[PDB]
Nucleic acid binder design. Structure first.
Ligand SMILES: [Mg+2]
Ligand SMILES: [Zn+2]
Ligand SMILES: [Zn+2]
Ligand SMILES: [Zn+2]
Ligand SMILES: [Zn+2]
Lengths: 175, 170, 138, 56
RNA sequence: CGCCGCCAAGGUAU
RNA sequence: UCUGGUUUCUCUUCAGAUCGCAUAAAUCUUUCGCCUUUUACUAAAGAUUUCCGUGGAGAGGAACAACUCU
């Protein structure tokens, strides 16, 4: 074979249920400890309940993780936003990836985004910490509709109803 | 919606591609080398038998041929962009070598691969309002009193000096 | 992490494990960042500085405090948490506030001498904030 | 094992903390391989021992 | 008693 | 009772010992075999080197050098 997946192996998997369907996000906990730690902590706190997808750029990105719905509400469980954690083997050459949304310097919290295609302008700028297992990537490809009314924020954005944790390494607590 | 299986195992194999099988051709037990091995083996066993007419199959009446592909290997592929085109026959119509030239004798000047690669990556007389906009013989929409004063100025038209001939209509 | 000694090391390793783990994490953070802003060698200064503070922590853990044993001291030297030749230079009388091993190599300097980092400041001129280009500061 | 246009795995943040799985490591039993049991699987078999080897 | 396993310059001018 | 030293790191020339219980390539001068001209060649001899390593010897330190051979 000659397909060459070109990525390190994953560790840890969570389930996330929206009105668009079920998404099984599997993370790189070794290659990105703090971002995956914040993600599994906010999934275990049931923090992403009633969180909508407030930005859709079709073919490029679809953003989530905002409990306010304006594009600036992000609260980590660290007290302060954490650092960028890059990897040469984790780049934006394909779809289905998950990355913390950033605004310049080391500012990462609950604000993240799913990828929808080739995103070479975002390389060495955002922290890739997970992907989506295929046969379930079309539940997040249904999130990209042209109903946006603006550059972002469509009419009826999909909300996350539950967030299950299938595998949980480095045991944590909800406060 | 596409429901999930709810498992902790990841999307694919554990080796991440370290055991590529390369099963593009006929597989191992059905390949012609295996058929020749079976035929050679059964010709080695039946020796004391002399035409038992159970007949054993087609080739057994009495590793070459289709050789087995290395299963543990991809062929190192290269893009041979460089064509062999008779340029003096393509853009001109007469090659000096005739039929002795080793090249193609082609005259199709279509796009190559790299060209596709680097192409895919990228009123009006008085200037007032239309006070009764009305026409002439030759489409010229004028006003009423302005074109009356224009006929008082000159008996022809204004745009191309057409002979109005006293004919003025809405 | 890589242990490369199959030892299951004796006491006391459980009390130096989170401290040296935090020093290893900060050494990875000092190794990871790009070289924008840091000119040519001042991005290479803090890895020397953190190896110096790790070797100094094991140094005053065993020699000064006399709490850890000699077997685990030799274990930490053999693994890579401490040096073998640098502590022999710290053992000498005239100096133990050394920067790293790039000021003692007299043929690293083409003029056949030691650096200005290994100079007493009280005998040097009064106000100059000079820093070593090999080692980092003094 | 790896495709083109790919850097050679960047050994600073990939497997620096990853332990190897297992070597060949044939199980030697005691009371038959007892003198060689402590050093048969060691990159230096005898180095820091002046009884058997010369030195370093 | 069982040879042998092939690249390029030679042509689409400077 | 006196006599009192194994390793490790740096220069120092000599090597005639399967210097290495094994063995790479290149050059020249010849014989061949593929060959159109050549570099890539084939494989035998003759004689040179290059190269990966090694042997014993003069010093300066350091490493438990004071255990102790004598
Ligand atoms: Mg010629
Ligand atoms: Zn031609
Ligand atoms: Zn110093
Ligand atoms: Zn220093
Ligand atoms: Zn200095």
């Amino acid at each position: 074979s000659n397909i060459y997946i070109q990525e390190p192996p994953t560790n840890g998997k969570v389930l996330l249920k929206t009105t668009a369907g079920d998404i099984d996000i599997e993370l790189w906990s070794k290659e990105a400890p703090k971002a995956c730690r914040n993600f599994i902590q906010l999934c275990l706190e049931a923090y992403y309940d009633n969180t909508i997808f407030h930005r859709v750029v079709p073919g490029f990105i679809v953003q989530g993780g905002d409990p306010t719905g304006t594009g600036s509400g992000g609260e980590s469980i660290y007290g302060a936003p954490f650092k960028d954690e890059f990897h040469s083997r984790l780049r934006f050459n394909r779809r289905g990836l998950v990355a913390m949304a950033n605004a310049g310097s080391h500012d990462n919290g609950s604000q993240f985004f799913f990828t929808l295609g080739r995103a070479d302008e975002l390389n060495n700028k955002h922290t890739i910490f997970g992907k989506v297992t295929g046969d379930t990537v079309y539940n997040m490809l249904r999130l990209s509709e042209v109903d946006i009314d603006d550059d972002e924020r469509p009419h009826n954005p999909h909300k996350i109803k539950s967030c299950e944790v299938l595998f949980n390494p480095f045991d944590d607590i909800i406060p | 919606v596409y429901k999930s299986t709810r498992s902790a195992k990841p999307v694919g194999p554990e080796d991440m591609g370290a055991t590529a099988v390369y099963e593009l051709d006929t597989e191992k037990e059905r390949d012609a080398q295996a058929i020749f091995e079976r035929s050679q083996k059964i010709q080695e066993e039946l020796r004391g038998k002399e035409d038992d007419k159970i007949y054993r199959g087609i080739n057994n009446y009495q590793r070459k041929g289709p050789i087995r592909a290395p299963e543990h290997l991809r062929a190192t592929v290269r893009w041979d962009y460089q064509p062999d085109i008779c340029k003096d026959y393509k853009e001109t119509g007469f090659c000096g070598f005739g039929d002795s030239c080793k090249f193609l004798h082609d005259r199709s000047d279509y796009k190559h691969g790299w060209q596709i690669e680097r192409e895919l990556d990228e009123c009006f007389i008085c200037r007032q309002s239309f006070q009764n906009p009305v026409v002439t013989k030759c489409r010229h929409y004028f006003c009423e009193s302005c074109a009356l004063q224009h006929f008082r100025t000159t008996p022809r038209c204004y745009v191309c000096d057409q002979q109005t001939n006293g004919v003025f209509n809405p | 992490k890589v242990k490369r000694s199959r030892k299951a090391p004796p006491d006391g390793w459980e009390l130096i494990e989170p401290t040296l783990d935090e020093l290893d994490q900060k050494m990875r953070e000092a190794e990871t960042e790009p070289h924008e802003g840091k000119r040519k060698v001042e991005s290479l200064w803090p890895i020397f500085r953190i190896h110096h503070q790790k070797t100094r922590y094991i140094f005053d853990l065993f020699y000064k405090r006399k709490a850890i044993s000699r077997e685990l001291y030799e274990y930490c030297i053999k693994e890579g948490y401490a040096d073998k030749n640098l502590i022999a230079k710290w053992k000498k009388q005239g100096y133990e506030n050394l920067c790293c091993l790039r000021c003692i190599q007299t043929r690293d300097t083409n003029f056949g001498t030691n650096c200005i980092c290994r100079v007493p400041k009280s005998k040097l001129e009064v106000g100059r904030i000079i820093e070593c280009t090999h080692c980092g500061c003094r | 094992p790896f495709d083109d246009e790919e850097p050679p795995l960047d050994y600073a943040d990939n497997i620096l903390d990853v332990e190897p799985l297992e070597a060949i490591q044939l199980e030697l039993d005691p009371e038959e391989d007892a003198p060689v049991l402590d050093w048969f699987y060691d990159h230096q078999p005898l180095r820091d021992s002046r009884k058997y080897v010369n030195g370093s």
